[PDB]
Amino acid sequence: RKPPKGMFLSQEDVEAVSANATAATTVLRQLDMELVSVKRQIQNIKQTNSALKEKLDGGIEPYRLPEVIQKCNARWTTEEQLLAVQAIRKYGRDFQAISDVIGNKSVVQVKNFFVNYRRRFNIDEVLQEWEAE
Amino acid sequence: PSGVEGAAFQSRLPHDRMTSQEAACFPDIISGPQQTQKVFLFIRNRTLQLWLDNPKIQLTFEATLQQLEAPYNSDTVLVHRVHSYLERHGLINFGIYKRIKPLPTKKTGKVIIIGSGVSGLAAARQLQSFGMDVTLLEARDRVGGRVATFRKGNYVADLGAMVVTGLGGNPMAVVSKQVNMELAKIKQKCPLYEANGQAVPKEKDEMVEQEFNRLLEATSYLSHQLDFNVLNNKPVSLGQALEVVIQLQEKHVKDEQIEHWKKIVKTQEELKELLNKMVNLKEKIKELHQQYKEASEVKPPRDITAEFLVKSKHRDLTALCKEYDELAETQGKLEEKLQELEANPPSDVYLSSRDRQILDWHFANLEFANATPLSTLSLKHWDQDDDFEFTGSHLTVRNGYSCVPVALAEGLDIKLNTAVRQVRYTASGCEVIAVNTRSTSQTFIYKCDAVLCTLPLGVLKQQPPAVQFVPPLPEWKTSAVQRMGFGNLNKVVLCFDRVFWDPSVNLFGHVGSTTASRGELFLFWNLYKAPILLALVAGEAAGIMENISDDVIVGRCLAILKGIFGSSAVPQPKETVVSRWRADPWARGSYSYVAAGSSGNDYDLMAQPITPGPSIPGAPQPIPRLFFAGEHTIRNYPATVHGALLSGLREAGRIADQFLGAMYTL
Numbered sequence A: 001r002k003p004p005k006g007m008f009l010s011q012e013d014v015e016a017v018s019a020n021a022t023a024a025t026t027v028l029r030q031l032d033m034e035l036v037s038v039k040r041q042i043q044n045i046k047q048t049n050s051a052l053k054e055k056l057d058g059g060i061e062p063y064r065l066p067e068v069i070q071k072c073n074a075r076w077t078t079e080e081q082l083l084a085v086q087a088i089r090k091y092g093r094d095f096q097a098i099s100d101v102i103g104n105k106s107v108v109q110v111k112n113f114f115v116n117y118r119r120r121f122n123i124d125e126v127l128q129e130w131e132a133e
Numbered sequence B: 001p002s003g004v005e006g007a008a009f010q011s012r013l014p015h016d017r018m019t020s021q022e023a024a025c026f027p028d029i030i031s032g033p034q035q036t037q038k039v040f041l042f043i044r045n046r047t048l049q050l051w052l053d054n055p056k057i058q059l060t061f062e063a064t065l066q067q068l069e070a071p072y073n074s075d076t077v078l079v080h081r082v083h084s085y086l087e088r089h090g091l092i093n094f095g096i097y098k099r100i101k102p103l104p105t106k107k108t109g110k111v112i113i114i115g116s117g118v119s120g121l122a123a124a125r126q127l128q129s130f131g132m133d134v135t136l137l138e139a140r141d142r143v144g145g146r147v148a149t150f151r152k153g154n155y156v157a158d159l160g161a162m163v164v165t166g167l168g169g170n171p172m173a174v175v176s177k178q179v180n181m182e183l184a185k186i187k188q189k190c191p192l193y194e195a196n197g198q199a200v201p202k203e204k205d206e207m208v209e210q211e212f213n214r215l216l217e218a219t220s221y222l223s224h225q226l227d228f229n230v231l232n233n234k235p236v237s238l239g240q241a242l243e244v245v246i247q248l249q250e251k252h253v254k255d256e257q258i259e260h261w262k263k264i265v266k267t268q269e270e271l272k273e274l275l276n277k278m279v280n281l282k283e284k285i286k287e288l289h290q291q292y293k294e295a296s297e298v299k300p301p302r303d304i305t306a307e308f309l310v311k312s313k314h315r316d317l318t319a320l321c322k323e324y325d326e327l328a329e330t331q332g333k334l335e336e337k338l339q340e341l342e343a344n345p346p347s348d349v350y351l352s353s354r355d356r357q358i359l360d361w362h363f364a365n366l367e368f369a370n371a372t373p374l375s376t377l378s379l380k381h382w383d384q385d386d387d388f389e390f391t392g393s394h395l396t397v398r399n400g401y402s403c404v405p406v407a408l409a410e411g412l413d414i415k416l417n418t419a420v421r422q423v424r425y426t427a428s429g430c431e432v433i434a435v436n437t438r439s440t441s442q443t444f445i446y447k448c449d450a451v452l453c454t455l456p457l458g459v460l461k462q463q464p465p466a467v468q469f470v471p472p473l474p475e476w477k478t479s480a481v482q483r484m485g486f487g488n489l490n491k492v493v494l495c496f497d498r499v500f501w502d503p504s505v506n507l508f509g510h511v512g513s514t515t516a517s518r519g520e521l522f523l524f525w526n527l528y529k530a531p532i533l534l535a536l537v538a539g540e541a542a543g544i545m546e547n548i549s550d551d552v553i554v555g556r557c558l559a560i561l562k563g564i565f566g567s568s569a570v571p572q573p574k575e576t577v578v579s580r581w582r583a584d585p586w587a588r589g590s591y592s593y594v595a596a597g598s599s600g601n602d603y604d605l606m607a608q609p610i611t612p613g614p615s616i617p618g619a620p621q622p623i624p625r626l627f628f629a630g631e632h633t634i635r636n637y638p639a640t641v642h643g644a645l646l647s648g649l650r651e652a653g654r655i656a657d658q659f660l661g662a663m664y665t666l
């Protein structure tokens, strides 16, 4: 049925090493060169990546803001309502963001607000202006 | 196997089946009912057992029937028929026995036998046993042919055959009980020793050996499975096939390296795309942080659009710091998945120089076994006789192998120093013309009913002919003689005042430097009671070492030995001998092999006898007159002593059937 274990002998391969006298050492050089060609290409990227790595030095450490950990509330200070209308202008339907901005409204209250004040804050219009971007 | 079935096996026959030869003489039986067949088969096996259990004395028809039982002893024609068939074909009462029924009063028919090789002798003894006038013509001044044994003082070393290959169904098993041969087994342990002079370690030893065997099974898979057997018109040799395998192994070694280093680039490339993403985020982050700072400067209290600004910028910055942390996450995984690949390379080489060299020594040992460069062995057929191997450890003949032909020659009309020059065979008889080797113009003529030619194949091969056939051998025969292979290997015999090597060791290699010299003095043998080491030259080397002097050879021998046992442990050898079988004109080589573009079939051609044309035209077809035996004529046991011996037995049966008739067929 089959070769010994880990010996490889495909029909196709046999043919390629027997096409002529040095069709043997032809094939085994294109491979020797293929290999060196890959092997240098590796050092190229290895080198390229080492330079991009040095550019991220320091991480993003002097750029991180501390944590607003804050207690989700149910009433809408007019302040909050205004933050929201503007968040909507800038975010469309990204309720998650709009919640994060407003600080203390869950992703749902944010959703609910949309239908509640739909009338009074003309969200219809506000949203269509978000879409103009 | 044991009992009567042990006998059948020990005589090379299937205990429960009738052979093609038996069918031929017993067609009444084998075309008939099962019951009868079994009776037959038993009688056969039983008789065999009898002979085998005691081969120092002749087994007569009487003795046989005596020891048979009912129902078997009931039919005495059938018992007689069997016993006689056996006797005729050398299955029983062969070799050297005490005869009960002393020799026929006068003889019938006359045979000349060319050569007192073993095949020769064996056949003579038989024919004489059958009351025939037999004479043998040997060119040499000794019997045995390619069984040559060196003797000087207490030194005893075969320059010829050396091994008995397992007694398990070996005629030599019988002969060994008939002749005091002193059989030592060969201990299969064999240390190698690199060109440097230091052992290979068990590690490598085994890992190369195993790759060897692996590369063989491989060739076999090319042959049988892929049908790789012609290469742009030319039969493919084993040698060729092995390279093709090795190349394909070297290749796959690299195809692997290729793909593993190709995983490395494919991996870093991702890493590059990620590091880019990351570096452009560190920017958008750097710049929004600026922005958020600027917008927290506007000091409260403030309008809501400016409050919004801070908060938005805040959220946008934390959003982007998520992302960059999730990428540093990824970057971490990839970055180790690279110290991962870079830790597991695949193998660097298929075989090193030190490896490929040891592996050569394994190929040398094949070239030894086949007496030829593997480039000449048939791929499809080189091992075609593996099915018939005997069972048992291989052995040596501690007292020298010559003891056998010599033994066989007793009782026999052997003309030594008589070189056959022409065989003439014709409808009504033959004449053989020979000369005397010491003065050659002295000339001899022998008339006979029949000629049995045991001339070595290398001899049958000589251009221009050393023996002439008159008429010439038919094309079918001569084509077979071209096609078949006749190889070579030589021995160097080293006699010393003292044992300086491992006395518990029979064999030990020397690895050569080059592929080209792989067989040169590649292997040494501690076989004998005296301090004698014996060294093979095989393969390509064999042929070329013939052309170098004995000293130059023994030099290289001692150089190797000093190398392995130390410069001062290795004394000057008292006596040295060096074979040159390809030069020897009564051999012209060492033994046959299945050359590329031969098959086993040619061996069968070598054996078919020749039947001359009719003397007067429209006379009826003659009788065959010219017969062949030897190492080369036996398809299933080529190149060996027993094989020869067997072909002798064979022809004698055949010849006798022809000239004495065979009353056992009715």
Ligand SMILES: Cc1cc2c(cc1C)N1[C@H](O)C[C@H](c3ccc(F)cc3)[C@]13C(=O)NC(=O)N=C3N2C[C@H](O)[C@H](O)[C@H](O)COP(=O)(O)OP(=O)(O)OC[C@H]1O[C@@H](n2cnc3c(N)ncnc32)[C@H](O)[C@@H]1O
Pocket (backbone or CB within 6 Å): B114, B115, B116, B117, B118, B119, B120, B137, B138, B139, B140, B143, B144, B145, B146, B147, B159, B160, B161, B162, B163, B164, B165, B418, B419, B420, B421, B454, B455, B456, B459, B466, B467, B489, B490, B491, B581, B585, B586, B587, B589, B590, B591, B629, B630, B631, B632, B638, B639, B640, B641, B642, B643, B644
């Ligand atoms: C040359 C040789 C042959 C052999 C070996 C070694 C050497 C050097 N050894 C090796 O060690 C491995 C081989 C091994 C192999 C396989 C294996 F599985 C394991 C180990 C082995 C061995 O170990 N064991 C083994 O069983 N056989 C070995 N051989 C091969 C045998 O020696 C060889 O098969 C037999 O001796 C063949 O006997 P036979 O066919 O009678 O040929 P022959 O040459 O004896 O007789 C012809 C006669 O005609 C005469 N003559 C010539 N010209 C003329 C003329 N013009 N006029 C008149 N007379 C003439 C000749 O002068 C001669 O007297």
